[PDB]
């Protein structure tokens, strides 16, 4: 067992200091370890490069194929599969577009999803693609 | 049975009173113009759907 | 010990009773120019919704109209003698029992 | 440096668990009986039973003769008889563990305009308020949620200038008479 | 006193009626008339009846008492109908007169409070 | 409208014996007129070819009210000895005083001398009544005017309701007997709700030695009232 | 011990068109608006489980001052038969708990059942009254509550009381 | 025949996720 | 959010309509459509079923 003397306040401190730095979650947040481990370097959202829709080359309408894209980002280079919210999205982006690209799939992936997609298409050119999709913007150029 | 007291609020006279109940349906005349509009419309469609 | 005389597996095998049973399922079945007030309010493509959704206190007041008639299947509304008694208006259903038993 | 105040509150909580049946259909009850808005109101009411419960709570965990306890618990009943909720002979925290929100619900001046006859509905009260044609003393009150004290009750009537109180005729009156 | 006209209230109970009289005929709760409060009692409305001991004839009013206990309604005596003449509200006499039941009523306290208060008379 | 009078009707038995029903455009409870010609407060009575029927009304007895309600059981049947405690004027003991018939026996204990002379007069017609002006509370007072009884129904209306009907029940209910009683939760306690009301009154029997059994309320025609029946000390 | 061996081994045991037409048909309760009980009152009667009474031991938590806690409302627990005689079956190791159970302002209500086993007789009183409150910490017994419409059912949840289905709950945990 | 479906639609939604409709195809295989 | 591009989509609810028989061989009877193939498809299979 443990002192339980009177006079054992520094003994007892020690102990709490070992016992803190075995926990995982504490070594991590205080040492900075893990502040650049997502896919977007730590940040929320990123910027990428549309470069050619996989659904649509392909000639299965499935359409949870169609709205499969491959994007590059920008901030790193690494090359993605998104998905596009709805088909007929897919019209308001063309290739070698920049977009803004969001997490996706942390609850789960609902019945005709394809697994292993973690990311979505949220913006085009600065507009988000609902106010697109629903006539309340129009895209620059 | 009569009541005194129901002279007015629950009472027939006797000229609308019958030996049946089938006879007090035969005339009542709201019951009557009822089944009729409801039997002509069954059997419209019975020779609707027949035809 | 055999089945009853009456049951047919008293004198029929496994093949007959599958052939019967296929037979007797098969026989059974038979000079400016102003904007719009559409350009003005960028409405767009927005979901059309009912007039009572624009009040949400009204709305609010038919759904306790609606919970009300709803409830009537579930239970009896108290009401006094305001006329005198001629009747139930409805049937006197004289096997079903309400009562709660005590065990 | 400045000469403002940053002094301010939040009046309501969500609620904790936010699927429950019962809670929805005590909320539909009470919004329906009392011709409520949405569910804030009931939620600002229900804040305003918790903190006084709980004051309560805390004033019976301590011993009778405390004088925390005696000076406190006078205050808090004081000030529950004179917005009426308890009763006179009721001056005991007990009597204050058994207070509900349809007590306080009764106290809107929107509920006193219709059960002292002035209109015909709940909701038809509301709209009475909200259109400037109630008084409460020499005051116009359009604020349904005002909570009417226990002396105040018995001077709530139309307000002089309304056209239900003796005032000029209104607008549709008015142009009505003028066509004809 | 006449023996038939048992549960006389005193003076700290006959204040409190009237008052509560007075605010009934505010709030349209009030019947007025022996052949009104009848009425009441036929149909389940009443919530107590108050009566005054001073009819010239108390047999006139002694029908009541009889259909009160039948319905189990609370009643008592009070000892002048010109009193009670003024607490309806009226410029005549009165014998007898009946509250009636309003659901959602201000009064239900009150109300409440009057008919224990009655039924401590009756032991 | 309604049933009235001078129309064709039909009247068949009831699933409770010495009940029956009344069967037309509008069904109505009716017991057997034991004394023919005559009705007791002004209800419609039906006639049938020497027989007489006459109507029960829910809204003025509490017995009439359990039985359209869904009751199981009422234990009040031809040839059966009935105490019956806070009879009132005797609007529902004319139709106990039918459905227990010539041979039954009914025991009206009423305490006001005002409601007694009714039953007094109610009495003379019908032989098979039994009235005694006394103070329920203290059943020795009466207990030589009573013999063994099978069925216990009170009406009183007081807060010591289970208390009245437990020294009654000690001293003239037979064992197996049966006892019905009627509970308006405002006047056992109007501070507490209705449904612990029931629940207290029920535990309060448990302990006098009576074994209810079954519970319905009364509500399309009484608010917060309730009937309980059950049996007292049951045989093996 | 033999105790919990026992104990494990009985919890293994346990798991013509003349005819008048009847059916017995229990009529729905008046107190219910729906799923929600309105004669559940500011005075709250709590029907007590016996392993609800060791595990307030375990958390230090004195049974009426809890509760209050939790309700900011006067709270009357009830104790059957049923349960009291199982906690006089544990024996001189559960002493402690056997006499908070006879505590004066604690009701002590009848119940003639046959039988000892106290989830059924709890569960009883729920179908015929609805005007307690099911304080418990077995999970089964949680799963036929909730079966029950209009019962609230209060719980431990870290070292305080919890209630589950009781829209005016005040004072209680978040999360 | 509503109610009916409705019942399914909750057992269809207490595995609508795509992890829970693998989970048992591996056990009832 | 799907179920937001879903429900403005839907916002129009015309739907797609039924062409008729030509009038120059209106004599013959009405067009059928795959609905009323139906009936008649699903009533021989029933008979030679039973045969
Ligand atoms: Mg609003
Ligand atoms: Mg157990
Ligand atoms: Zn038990």
Redesign the pocket.
């Given at each position: 067992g443990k002192c339980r003397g009177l006079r054992t306040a520094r003994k007892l401190r020690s102990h709490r200091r070992d016992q803190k730095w075995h926990d995982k979650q504490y070594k991590k947040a205080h040492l900075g370890t893990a502040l650049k481990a997502n896919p977007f370097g730590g940040a929320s959202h990123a910027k990428g490069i549309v470069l050619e829709k996989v659904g649509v080359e392909a000639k299965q309408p499935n359409s949870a194929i169609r709205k499969c894209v491959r994007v590059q980002l920008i901030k790193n280079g690494k090359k993605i599969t998104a998905f596009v919210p709805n088909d007929g999205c897919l019209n308001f982006i063309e290739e070698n577009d920049e977009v803004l690209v969001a997490g996706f799939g942390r609850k789960g992936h609902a019945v005709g999803d394809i697994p292993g997609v973690r990311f979505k298409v949220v913006k085009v050119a600065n507009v988000s693609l609902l106010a697109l999709y629903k006539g309340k913007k129009e895209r620059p150029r | 049975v009569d009541n005194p007291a129901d002279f007015y609020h629950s009472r027939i006279p006797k000229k609308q009173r019958k030996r049946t109940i089938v006879e007090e349906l035969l005339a009542d005349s709201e019951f009557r113009r009822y089944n009729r509009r409801k039997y002509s419309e069954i059997m419209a469609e019975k020779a609707a759907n027949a035809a | 010990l055999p089945p009853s005389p009456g049951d047919t597996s008293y004198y029929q095998d496994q093949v007959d009773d599958f052939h019967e049973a296929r037979s007797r399922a098969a026989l059974a079945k038979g000079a400016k120019r102003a904007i719009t007030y559409q350009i003005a309010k960028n409405r767009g493509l927005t979901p059309r919704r009912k007039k009572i959704d624009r009040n949400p206190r009204v709305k609010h007041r038919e759904k306790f109209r609606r919970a009300k008639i709803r409830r009537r299947g579930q239970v009896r509304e108290v009401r006094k003698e305001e006329q005198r008694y001629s009747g139930e208006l409805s049937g006197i259903r004289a096997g079903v029992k309400k009562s709660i038993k005590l065990k | 440096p400045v000469a403002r105040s940053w002094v301010c509150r939040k009046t309501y909580v969500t609620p904790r668990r936010p699927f429950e049946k019962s809670r929805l259909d005590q909320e539909l009850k009470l919004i329906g009986e009392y011709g409520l808005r949405n569910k804030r109101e009931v939620w600002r009411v229900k804040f305003t039973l918790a903190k006084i419960r709980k004051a309560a709570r805390e004033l019976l965990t301590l011993d009778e003769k405390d004088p925390r306890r005696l000076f406190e618990g006078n205050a808090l009943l004081r000030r529950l008889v004179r917005i009426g909720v308890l009763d006179e002979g009721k001056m005991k925290l007990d009597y204050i563990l058994g207070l509900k929100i349809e007590d306080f619900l009764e106290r809107r001046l929107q509920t006193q305009v219709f059960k002292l006859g002035l209109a015909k509905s709940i909701h038809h009260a509301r709209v009475l308020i909200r259109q400037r044609h109630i008084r409460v003393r020499k005051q116009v009150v359009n604020i349904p949620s005002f909570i009417v004290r226990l002396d105040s009750q018995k001077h709530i009537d139309f307000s002089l200038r309304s056209p239900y109180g003796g005032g000029r005729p209104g607008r549709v009156k008015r142009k009505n008479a003028k066509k004809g | 006193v006449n023996p038939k006209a048992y549960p006389l209230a005193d003076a700290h109970l006959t204040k409190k009626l009237l008052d509560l009289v007075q605010q009934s005929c505010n709030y349209k709760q009030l019947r007025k008339g022996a052949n009104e409060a009848t009425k009441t009692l036929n149909r389940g409305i009443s919530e107590f009846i108050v009566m005054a001991a001073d009819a010239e004839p108390l047999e006139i009013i002694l029908h009541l008492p009889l259909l009160c206990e039948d319905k189990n309604v609370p009643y008592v005596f009070v000892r002048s109908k010109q009193a009670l003449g003024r607490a309806c509200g009226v410029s005549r006499p009165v014998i007898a007169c009946s509250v009636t039941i309003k659901e959602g009523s201000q009064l239900k306290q009150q109300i409440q409070s009057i008919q224990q208060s009655i039924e401590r008379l009756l032991v | 409208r309604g049933n009235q009078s001078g129309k064709n009707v039909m009247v068949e038995p009831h699933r409770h014996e010495g009940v029956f029903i009344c069967r037309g455009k509008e069904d109505a409870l009716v017991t057997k007129n034991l004394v023919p010609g005559e009705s007791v407060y002004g209800e419609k009575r039906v006639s049938i070819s020497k027989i007489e029927y006459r109507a029960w009304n829910p809204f003025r007895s509490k017995l009439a009210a359990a039985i359209l309600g869904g009751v199981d059981q009422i234990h009040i049947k031809p040839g059966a000895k009935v105490l019956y405690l806070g009879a009132a004027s005797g609007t529902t003991v004319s139709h106990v005083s039918d459905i227990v018939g010539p041979d039954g026996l009914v025991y009206a204990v009423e305490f006001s001398h005002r409601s007694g002379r009714d039953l007094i007069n109610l009495a003379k017609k019908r032989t098979n009544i039994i009235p005694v002006i006394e103070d329920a509370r203290h059943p020795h007072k009466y207990r030589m005017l009573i013999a063994m009884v099978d069925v216990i129904f009170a009406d009183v209306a007081q807060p010591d309701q289970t208390r009245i009907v437990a020294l009654n029940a000690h001293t003239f209910l037979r064992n197996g007997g049966h006892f019905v009683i009627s509970i308006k939760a405002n006047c056992i306690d109007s501070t507490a709700s209705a449904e612990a009301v029931f629940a207290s009154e029920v535990k309060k029997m448990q302990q006098e030695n009576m074994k209810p059994q079954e519970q319905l309320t009364l509500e399309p025609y009484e608010r917060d009232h309730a009937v309980v029946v059950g049996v007292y000390r049951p045989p093996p | 011990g033999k105790q919990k061996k026992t104990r494990k081994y009985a919890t293994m045991k346990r798991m013509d068109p003349s005819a008048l037409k009847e059916r017995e048909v229990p009529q729905h309760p008046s107190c219910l608006f729906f799923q929600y009980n309105t004669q559940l009152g500011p005075p709250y009667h709590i029907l007590v489980?016996?392993?609800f009474i060791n595990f307030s031991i375990k958390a230090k938590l004195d049974l009426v001052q809890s509760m209050m806690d939790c309700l900011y409302a006067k709270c009357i627990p009830c104790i059957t038969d049923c349960v009291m005689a199982?906690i006089e079956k544990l024996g001189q190791k559960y002493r402690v708990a056997l006499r908070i159970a006879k505590d004066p302002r604690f009701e002590r209500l009848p119940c003639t059942h046959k039988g000892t086993?106290?989830?059924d007789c709890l569960v009883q009183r729920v179908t015929q009254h609805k005007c307690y409150i099911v304080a418990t910490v077995?999970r089964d017994?949680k799963r036929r509550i909730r079966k029950i419409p209009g019962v609230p059912i209060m719980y431990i949840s870290n070292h305080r009381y919890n209630i589950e289905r009781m829209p005016d709950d005040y004072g209680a945990p978040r999360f | 025949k509503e109610h009916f479906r409705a019942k399914q639609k909750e057992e269809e939604e207490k595995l609508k996720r795509q992890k829970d409709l693998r989970k048992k195809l591996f056990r009832i295989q | 959010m799907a179920a937001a591009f879903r429900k403005a989509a839907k916002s129009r609810q015309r739907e797609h309509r039924e062409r008729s028989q030509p009038g120059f061989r209106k004599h013959l009877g009405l067009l059928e459509k795959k609905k009323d193939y139906k009936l008649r498809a699903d009533d021989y299979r029933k008979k030679q079923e039973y045969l």
């Open positions: - | - | - | - | - | - | 489980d016996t392993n199982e086993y106290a989830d077995d017994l | - | -």
